Enzyme design. Structure first.
Site, PDB file in Angstrom:
ATOM      1  N   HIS A 134       0.828  -1.197   0.000  1.00 48.06           N
ATOM      2  CA  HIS A 134       0.000   0.000   0.000  1.00 48.06           C
ATOM      3  C   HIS A 134       0.867   1.254   0.000  1.00 48.06           C
ATOM      4  CE1 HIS A 134      -3.924  -2.042   1.564  1.00 48.06           C
ATOM      5  NE2 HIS A 134      -3.875  -1.998   0.245  1.00 48.06           N
ATOM      6  N   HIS A 169      -8.713  -4.049   8.452  1.00 43.11           N
ATOM      7  CA  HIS A 169      -7.893  -3.765   9.615  1.00 43.11           C
ATOM      8  C   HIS A 169      -8.516  -4.442  10.829  1.00 43.11           C
ATOM      9  CE1 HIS A 169      -5.456  -0.592   7.606  1.00 43.11           C
ATOM     10  NE2 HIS A 169      -6.575  -0.356   6.944  1.00 43.11           N
TER      11      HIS A 169
HETATM   12  C1  LIG Z   1      -4.149   7.446  -8.514  1.00 40.46           C
HETATM   13  O1  LIG Z   1      -3.477   6.811  -7.430  1.00 40.46           O
HETATM   14  C2  LIG Z   1      -3.220   7.564  -6.315  1.00 40.46           C
HETATM   15  C3  LIG Z   1      -3.121   8.944  -6.391  1.00 40.46           C
HETATM   16  C4  LIG Z   1      -2.852   9.662  -5.239  1.00 40.46           C
HETATM   17  C5  LIG Z   1      -2.687   9.012  -4.027  1.00 40.46           C
HETATM   18  C6  LIG Z   1      -2.788   7.623  -3.944  1.00 40.46           C
HETATM   19  C7  LIG Z   1      -2.624   6.921  -2.646  1.00 40.46           C
HETATM   20  C8  LIG Z   1      -1.660   7.328  -1.723  1.00 40.46           C
HETATM   21  C9  LIG Z   1      -1.510   6.661  -0.518  1.00 40.46           C
HETATM   22  C10 LIG Z   1      -2.316   5.578  -0.210  1.00 40.46           C
HETATM   23  C11 LIG Z   1      -3.281   5.156  -1.116  1.00 40.46           C
HETATM   24  N1  LIG Z   1      -4.111   4.049  -0.821  1.00 40.46           N
HETATM   25  C12 LIG Z   1      -3.731   2.807  -0.448  1.00 40.46           C
HETATM   26  O2  LIG Z   1      -2.563   2.472  -0.272  1.00 40.46           O
HETATM   27  C13 LIG Z   1      -4.871   1.836  -0.263  1.00 40.46           C
HETATM   28  C14 LIG Z   1      -4.940   1.263   1.156  1.00 40.46           C
HETATM   29  C15 LIG Z   1      -5.276   2.315   2.189  1.00 40.46           C
HETATM   30  C16 LIG Z   1      -6.039   3.424   1.821  1.00 40.46           C
HETATM   31  C17 LIG Z   1      -6.359   4.407   2.745  1.00 40.46           C
HETATM   32  C18 LIG Z   1      -5.916   4.297   4.051  1.00 40.46           C
HETATM   33  C19 LIG Z   1      -5.156   3.193   4.417  1.00 40.46           C
HETATM   34  C20 LIG Z   1      -4.828   2.185   3.515  1.00 40.46           C
HETATM   35  B1  LIG Z   1      -3.988   1.059   4.348  1.00 40.46           B
HETATM   36  O3  LIG Z   1      -4.582  -0.292   4.355  1.00 40.46           O
HETATM   37  O4  LIG Z   1      -2.571   0.879   3.959  1.00 40.46           O
HETATM   38  O5  LIG Z   1      -4.089   1.552   5.724  1.00 40.46           O
HETATM   39  C21 LIG Z   1      -4.575   2.914   5.770  1.00 40.46           C
HETATM   40  C22 LIG Z   1      -3.429   5.829  -2.323  1.00 40.46           C
HETATM   41  C23 LIG Z   1      -3.057   6.901  -5.107  1.00 40.46           C
HETATM   42 FE   LIG Z   2      -2.672  -1.227   4.145  1.00 35.63          FE
HETATM   43 FE   LIG Z   3      -1.931   1.594   6.056  1.00 37.78          FE
END
Ligand SMILES: COc1cccc(-c2cccc(NC(=O)CCc3cccc4c3[B-](O)(O)OC4)c2)c1
Ligand SMILES: [Fe+3]
Ligand SMILES: [Fe+3]
Ligand SMILES: [Cl-]
Ligand SMILES: [Cl-]
EC number: 3.1.27.-
Length: 426
Positions: free
Chosen positions: A76, A363
């Site tokens: 992630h 989670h």
């Molecule tokens: C177009 O692509 C894009 C553009 C801009 C930003 C992102 C982006 C950036 C960081 C995380 C993410 N999301 C992820 O990793 C998905 C899993 C996720 C999502 C939200 C919060 C959490 C998690 B977790 O399960 O790792 O725990 C906390 C996308 C991507």
């Molecule tokens: Fe995650």
């Molecule tokens: Fe996370």
């Protein structure tokens, strides 16, 4: 403190734990560990709710040329999104490790992320690939006198919980983990090897997850309601992980309801009987009713954002948010039910489509976290990866669980970013 694996005691050694990201927040996971001359970085992600250099952890607080070891828990982007920048745009010369499955998804995932103030380029991503070593589960590796191995975390494919041992002191970092068995993923293992220190996520604080059969039923009912009134249903998902789960549930529900057989379900990213694959907007006939599962999961940009902007003005349509919503994202903003949204092009549109939140982020809840801590009983627990209010309630609830415990007194810490936790071991 006597190590749990271990007479006139000699000198005490001090262990330092400092989060540069995910300290009293969700996003940009990056925790520094310092003990007996060794320095370790745990994860290296970006904040999904911030932009540019602001989305990075506070790397300036450390000298990256002194980091011996970097451990990545899963693919992630809030745990590995900053890795190419750290490997290519910084004096870091240590060793980086992730599981085999994690590295395989990382190369395609971040390549997608770059395509859709740029921290790194696809060039930087490919040159840093060979700097990343892999590791199997349940296999000890040693780097600069640091012994480490990983357990299954659940959550997503390849997700690992790293155990670290230096000079007999053992530390367990959960990363993101889940203890609820999935349809295509195992639950996180509970190590029998007992750690002195536990660093554990706190995403949902003291919340308790609704039973899986209830959330799946409400998810399918909401999708059904949207398409039945002639609407288009948007399910924003992060590329890989929870998307396959939701597709199984919808494919099963479609089979058991023939009145929906003519309604298409599209999965758009880069074997079901009712789900079609979608390449991009060009290959997609936007004919309502329909269901479209698209990336990214929080509509920051990309296809899910384009479809939301195209559909948000029609009250027959609807969006179903299945993941955790981070502050600063559009998915979190629409939870407040605003009258209007702002498009990426800067235009205002009335928000008339239905908005529903059915959590499937995978989670641990309080029961799973409490059971996990009770099985390990580590003298020190450090909470990361959670909003300030949720993390403060989790800390207080866990403390109350061990005030009347004469066997063990467990200390719980919730350090802010850059705040150091110091522990002395004899
Ligand atoms: C177009 O692509 C894009 C553009 C801009 C930003 C992102 C982006 C950036 C960081 C995380 C993410 N999301 C992820 O990793 C998905 C899993 C996720 C999502 C939200 C919060 C959490 C998690 B977790 O399960 O790792 O725990 C906390 C996308 C991507
Ligand atoms: Fe995650
Ligand atoms: Fe996370
Ligand atoms: Cl030593
Ligand atoms: Cl300090």
């Amino acid at each position: 403190l006597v190590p749990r694996g271990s007479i006139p005691a000699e000198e005490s050694d001090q262990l330092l734990i400092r989060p540069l990201g995910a300290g009293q927040e969700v996003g940009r996971s990056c925790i520094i560990l310092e003990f007996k001359g060794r320095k370790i970085m745990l994860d290296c992600g970006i904040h999904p709710g911030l932009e540019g250099m602001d989305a990075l952890p506070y790397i300036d607080l450390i000298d990256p040329a002194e980091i011996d070891l970097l451990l990545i828990s899963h693919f992630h982007l809030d745990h590995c999104g900053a890795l190419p920048w750290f490997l290519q745009k910084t004096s870091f010369k240590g060793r980086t490790f992730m599981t085999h499955a994690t590295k395989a998804i990382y190369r395609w995932l971040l390549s997608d992320y770059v395509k859709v103030d740029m921290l790194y380029t696809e060039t930087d991503l490919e040159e840093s690939m060979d700097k990343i070593e892999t590791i199997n589960f349940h296999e000890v590796k040693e780097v600069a006198g640091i012994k480490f191995w990983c357990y299954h975390a659940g959550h997503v494919l390849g997700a690992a919980m790293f155990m670290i041992e230096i000079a007999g002191v053992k530390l367990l970092y959960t990363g993101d983990f889940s203890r609820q068995e999935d349809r295509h993923l195992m639950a996180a293992e509970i190590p029998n090897i007992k750690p002195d220190i536990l660093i554990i996520e706190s995403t949902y604080g003291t919340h308790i997850h609704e039973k899986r059969e209830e959330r799946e039923a409400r998810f399918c009912n909401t999708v059904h309601d949207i398409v039945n009134r002639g609407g288009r249903g948007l399910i924003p998902v992060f590329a890989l992980g929870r998307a396959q789960e939701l597709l199984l549930i919808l494919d099963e529900y479609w089979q058991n309801h023939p009145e929906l057989h003519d309604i298409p379900i599209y999965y758009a990213s880069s074997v079901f009987k009712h789900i079609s694959n979608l390449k991009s907007m060009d290959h997609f006939d936007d004919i309502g009713p329909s269901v479209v599962m698209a990336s990214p999961g929080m509509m920051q940009s990309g296809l899910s954002r384009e479809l939301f902007e195209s559909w948000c003005t029609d009250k027959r349509n609807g969006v179903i948010i299945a993941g955790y919503c981070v502050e600063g994202t559009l998915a979190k903003h629409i939870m407040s039910e605003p009258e209007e949204i702002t498009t990426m092009s800067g235009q205002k549109l009335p928000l008339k489509m239905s908005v529903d939140y059915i959590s499937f982020s995978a989670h641990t809840d309080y029961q799973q976290t409490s059971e996990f801590i009770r099985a390990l009983k580590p003298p020190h627990v450090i909470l990361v990866h959670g909003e300030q209010n949720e993390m403060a309630r989790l800390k207080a609830a866990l403390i109350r669980e061990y005030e009347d415990n004469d066997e063990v007194h467990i200390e719980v810490h919730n350090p802010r970013n850059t705040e150091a936790v110091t522990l002395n071991f004899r």
